[PDB]
Subunit: 87 residues, 2 copies
Amino acid sequence: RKVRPEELPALLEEGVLVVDVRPARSTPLPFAAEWVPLEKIQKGEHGLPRRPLLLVCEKGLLSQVAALYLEAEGYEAMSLEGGLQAL
Amino acid sequence: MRKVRPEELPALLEEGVLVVDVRPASTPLPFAAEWVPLEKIQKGEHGLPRRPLLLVCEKGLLSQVAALYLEAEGYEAMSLEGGLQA
C-alpha cells in the first residue's frame, strides 16, 4: 500500500518505522529513518524488525521495489507515493 | 540509564519504541525487535534511527551498557530492567 503525504502525520505519531532504501541520498530526511539500501535488501542482508515499515526514497522508484522484496519475506511494508519529492 | 520495569512495558510498546535485542548468537523475544550486537554498538557502527530506543537482553546487564553508549550519541536509550528472563 502506498502512503500519500497527507496520511503520514497519522502514521508517524503511531511510531511507524521509516526505512530509507536509497543508495549511498539527495533530499533531506524528514523522518528518523534507518538506512537500508535496496541493493542490500535485494540480497536479504538486512535486519529490519518484524514490524510495519515505511520505505522511502528520492522519487518512489526504489522504495516500491524494496517494498515488494520485504513483502515476500513476510514483512508488512509500504512506501511514500511520489518519494520524498511529493512533499 | 532508564531502567524499564516490566510493569511500564505495555505503555512503552504502545508508543512504538524500537526494540533492540543485544544478546549475541535464553527467553523468547516477545518484541518485534531489531537485533544489534553490543560490540556493534560499542563501535558506533550501528544504524539505529534517532528515535526512542529500548534495549533488552537476558539478565539486563548487556542492554545497560549499550544504553550508556547510545546515550552518548544523543540517543534516548532505555533498558528493560531485569532483562528478558525477568
